[PDB]
C-alpha cells in the first residue's frame, strides 16, 4: 500500500475493482467499457488519497478538482459524483475535521439516535454534516458507552476496550490523526507462571503454544473436511471440536502403545519357539554324544560296521552342533532387538497435567479474545472475520480511549441521563418515549422522522424488555437477536505507588489450577506508564466473578502477585476498580460473538432497517423508519470500536440517502 493503491487499501477498498456499493451508485459505469471503469477507480482512489493525506480539514469538491490532473479533471460531473459518493458513505470527511463549507442553519429531517456510543456519535456527526437535525439520547451520565476510561489523579485505565487492532486499513488511524491520542505498541512477549508461582520453562511454553495452534487447525479441518458441524441435531461448538480432537490424540497415543507392545509379544513368541527348538536340539545332542562315546569306546580293531557307527555318530553330532550355533546366533539377534524395543517406548501420554494446564491458559486467552466460553462459539463461523484483520501491530491509547468519544461528542445535542423506554415507529414518523434516570417519574417525548437504534445486543436481548418497540420488531429481527451471542469479560484495575514488576514486559500470564478456573485472573497488563496493573477475567470465570466482592477479587489478585513476585514485594494497592459488564444494565455483557447456531448473516439481519406498515389501508408505504447500527450490526468488523464507527457511518449514509435524496446516482 502506497500511492493511490495505498489509499484504497487504507479505505478497505480494492484498488483495481468497483465494489457492489459503487455498482449500485454508478451502474452506468460498471456496465459500460473498462476504460471508464478505470477512470472512475482512479478518481475514487485519488480523492481517498487527498482525504487521507490531511484528514484534519474538510476535502471540498473544488479542492478535489483543482488538486487533480488532466485528463481526469476534464469530466467534472463524474468527479463530483465520486466525491459526493465518498462523502455520503463516510469514506472521506468523517470524524473530526475543520469545516470549510460551514453547516447550513436550514436543517432538514429529524433523527433521534438512541445511545451516545461510538457508533451513535459517528452517525450523529455524519448526519449533522449532511444538514440534518440530530439529537442523541443516552442513559449514562457520559458519552462513549463501552469505551469507558477510569481516571483518578494521573492514573488512567480502560475498563472498555483499550487495543487498536492494527492501523492498516483502520479508520481509527484517521481518527488518531484527528484526536490527541497517544498510541503505544504492545510487546506480545508474555511469560507464564504456574499456580505455585514457578515460571513456565520457555521450551514448554513453545511446545504447548504450537500444540494449541495445531489443535485449532485440527478443529478447522474437522469442520471443513469432515462436515463435523452438527451432532444429534445441534450445532457443534469450537469447544466440542477441541474436546473431540484432544480425545482422538489420546486415543492415538494408546493405539501406538498397543502396537509397540504387540510387536514386543510377537518377537518374544518368536524367541520362545526358537528356545524350545534349541532345548530339544541340546537334548538330542546330549544323547548323540553319549551314543558317540559308547560307540567310540569299542576299542579297535573293529569291523567296518562299528567304524561306520563311530564316524556316522561323529558327523551327525557335528551337524546338530552347527544347527545349535546358528540358532544361538538368531537368539542373540532377537535379544538385542528386544532390548532396543524395551529401550524405545513411544509417547507416554498426550498431555501431562502441567501441559493441560498451560493449554487451558491458551484456551483462556482465546476465550478472552472472543469474550465467551469456547462451548458457545460456532465451530463453523467463529473465525469468519479473520480475513479482514488490519495490518500493523496492535496498539493502545495511553491517555485513555475515552478521549475519542468525548472529542466526537463536541457540537452534538446529547441528552444524558435519558433512558429510552419505548420506540414508536409509524408510517408518518416516529416518537421515542424516554425518562430521566435521576427521577424516573419525569418523562420525555421526542418526535422525529427517523430513529437510529444503537442499543447493544445485550439490551435488545433483555427479557422482559428494557425498551419496547411499537409495533413489535418483526420475527426475522428478534430471531437474529436470539441467535447471536453476547459475551462477557471483565477487568480489575490495581493502582499501586511502586512498580514491583518487570518494566520491559507489557503483559504476563497466570496458569490456572483447573479447567473451570482457567479464566480466573489469567492475564496481567502493564501498559500504562504508571504503577497500574490490569488483571483480566474471561470464560465462565467472567460471569461467576461478578457475584464476588471487590475485596475478594483484589485478594485473589494479590495472592497470585505475591506468589509470582514474592510475598513482600507486593504493596497494598492505593486504588482499585472491578468492571462488571454483564451486570451493567446499559450493556448487559461485553460484546457479541458468533454463537453456535448463528452466522454472519445474522449480523447482516441486525442492520436491516424496519419499514412500518401503512397508516391508511391501501396506501403506499415507501419509507423505512427504524435504523440499526453498532458493534453487532457489522458483519466484517464485529466486536470492535472501528466496527461500531463504520456501522454508524453506514447508517448515517443510508438515512441521508433516504431523507435527503441521493444526488450522486443520476
Amino acid at each position: 500500500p502506497s500511492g493511490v493503491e495505498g489509499a484504497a487499501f487504507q479505505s478497505r477498498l480494492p484498488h483495481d475493482r468497483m465494489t457492489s456499493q459503487e455498482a449500485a451508485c454508478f451502474p452506468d459505469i460498471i456496465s459500460g467499457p473498462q476504460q471508464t471503469q478505470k477512470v472512475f477507480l482512479f478518481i475514487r482512489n485519488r480523492t481517498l488519497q487527498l482525504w487521507l493525506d490531511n484528514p484534519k480539514i474538510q476535502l471540498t469538491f473544488e479542492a478535489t478538482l483543482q488538486q487533480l490532473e488532466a485528463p481526469y479533471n476534464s469530466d467534472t460531473v463524474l468527479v463530483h459524483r465520486v466525491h459526493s459518493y465518498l462523502e455520503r458513505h463516510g469514506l472521506i470527511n468523517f470524524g473530526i475535521y475543520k469545516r470549510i463549507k460551514p453547516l447550513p442553519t436550514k436543517k432538514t429531517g429529524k433523527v433521534i439516535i438512541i445511545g451516545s456510543g461510538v457508533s451513535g456519535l459517528a452517525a450523529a456527526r455524519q448526519l449533522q454534516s449532511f444538514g440534518m437535525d440530530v439529537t442523541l439520547l443516552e442513559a449514562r451520565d457520559r458519552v462513549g458507552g463501552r469505551v469507558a476510561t477510569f481516571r483518578k489523579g494521573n492514573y488512567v485505565a480502560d475498563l472498555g476496550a483499550m487495543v487498536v487492532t492494527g492501523l492498516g486499513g483502520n479508520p481509527m488511524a484517521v481518527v488518531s490523526k484527528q484526536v490527541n491520542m497517544e498510541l503505544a505498541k504492545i510487546k506480545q512477549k508474555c511469560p507464564l507462571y504456574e499456580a505455585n508461582g514457578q515460571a513456565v520453562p520457555k521450551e514448554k511454553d513453545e511446545m504447548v503454544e504450537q500444540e494449541f495452534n495445531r489443535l485449532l487447525e485440527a478443529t478447522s479441518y474437522l469442520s471443513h473436511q469432515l462436515d463435523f458441524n452438527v451432532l444429534n441435531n445441534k450445532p457443534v461448538s469450537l469447544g466440542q471440536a477441541l474436546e473431540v480432537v484432544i480425545q482422538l490424540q489420546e486415543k492415538h497415543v494408546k493405539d501406538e502403545q498397543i502396537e509397540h507392545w504387540k510387536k514386543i509379544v510377537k518377537t518374544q513368541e518368536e524367541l520362545k519357539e526358537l528356545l524350545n527348538k534349541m532345548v530339544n536340539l541340546k537334548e538330542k545332542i546330549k544323547e548323540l554324544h553319549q551314543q558317540y562315546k559308547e560307540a567310540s569306546e569299542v576299542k579297535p580293531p573293529r569291523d567296518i560296521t562299528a567304524e561306520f557307527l563311530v564316524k556316522s555318530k561323529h558327523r551327525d553330532l557335528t551337524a546338530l552342533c552347527k544347527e545349535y550355533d546358528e540358532l544361538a546366533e538368531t537368539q542373540g539377534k532377537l535379544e538385542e532387538k528386544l532390548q532396543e524395543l524395551e529401550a524405545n517406548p513411544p509417547s507416554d501420554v498426550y498431555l501431562s497435567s502441567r501441559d493441560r494446564q498451560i493449554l487451558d491458559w491458551h484456551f483462556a486467552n482465546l476465550e478472552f479474545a472472543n469474550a465467551t466460553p469456547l462451548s458457545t462459539l460456532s465451530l463453523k463461523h467463529w473465525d469468519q472475520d479473520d480475513d479482514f484483520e488490519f495490518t500493523g501491530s496492535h496498539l493502545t491509547v495511553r491517555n485513555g480511549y475515552s478521549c475519542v468519544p468525548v472529542a466526537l461528542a463536541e457540537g452534538l445535542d446529547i441528552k444524558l441521563n435519558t433512558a429510552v423506554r419505548q420506540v414508536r415507529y409509524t408510517a408518518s414518523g416516529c416518537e421515542v418515549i424516554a425518562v430521566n434516570t435521576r427521577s424516573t417519574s419525569q418523562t420525555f417525548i421526542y418526535k422525529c422522522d427517523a430513529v437510529l437504534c444503537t442499543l447493544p445486543l445485550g439490551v435488545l436481548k433483555q427479557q422482559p424488555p428494557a425498551v419496547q418497540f411499537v409495533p413489535p420488531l418483526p420475527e426475522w429481527k428478534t430471531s437474529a437477536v436470539q441467535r447471536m451471542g453476547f459475551g462477557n469479560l471483565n477487568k480489575v484495575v490495581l493502582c499501586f505507588d511502586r512498580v514491583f514488576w518487570d518494566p520491559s514486559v507489557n503483559l504476563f500470564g497466570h496458569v490456572g489450577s483447573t479447567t473451570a478456573s482457567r479464566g480466573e485472573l489469567f492475564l496481567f497488563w502493564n501498559l500504562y506508564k504508571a504503577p497500574i496493573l490490569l488483571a483480566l477475567v474471561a470464560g465462565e470465570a467472567a460471569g461467576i466473578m461478578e457475584n464476588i466482592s471487590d475485596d475478594v477479587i483484589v485478594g485473589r489478585c494479590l495472592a497470585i502477585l505475591k506468589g509470582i513476585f514474592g510475598s513482600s514485594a507486593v504493596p497494598q494497592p492505593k486504588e482499585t476498580v472491578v468492571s462488571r459488564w454483564r451486570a451493567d444494565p446499559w450493556a448487559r455483557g461485553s460484546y457479541s460473538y458468533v454463537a453456535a447456531g448463528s452466522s454472519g448473516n445474522d449480523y447482516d439481519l441486525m442492520a436491516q432497517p424496519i419499514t412500518p406498515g401503512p397508516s391508511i389501508p391501501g396506501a403506499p408505504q415507501p419509507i423505512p423508519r427504524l435504523f440499526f447500527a453498532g458493534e453487532h450490526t457489522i458483519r466484517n468488523y464485529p466486536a470492535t470500536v472501528h466496527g461500531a464507527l463504520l456501522s454508524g457511518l453506514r447508517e448515517a449514509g443510508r438515512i441521508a440517502d433516504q431523507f435527503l435524496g441521493a444526488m450522486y446516482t443520476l
Binding site: T437, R438, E546, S549, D550, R580, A583, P585
Partner: peptide, 15 residues
C-alpha cells in the same frame, strides 16, 4: 430513582 436504583445494586455486587 433509576440512577439511585442502579447505584445501590452495583454497590450490592461491590460488597
Amino acid at each position: 430513582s433509576e440512577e439511585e436504583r442502579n447505584a445501590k445494586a452495583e454497590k450490592e455486587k461491590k460488597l
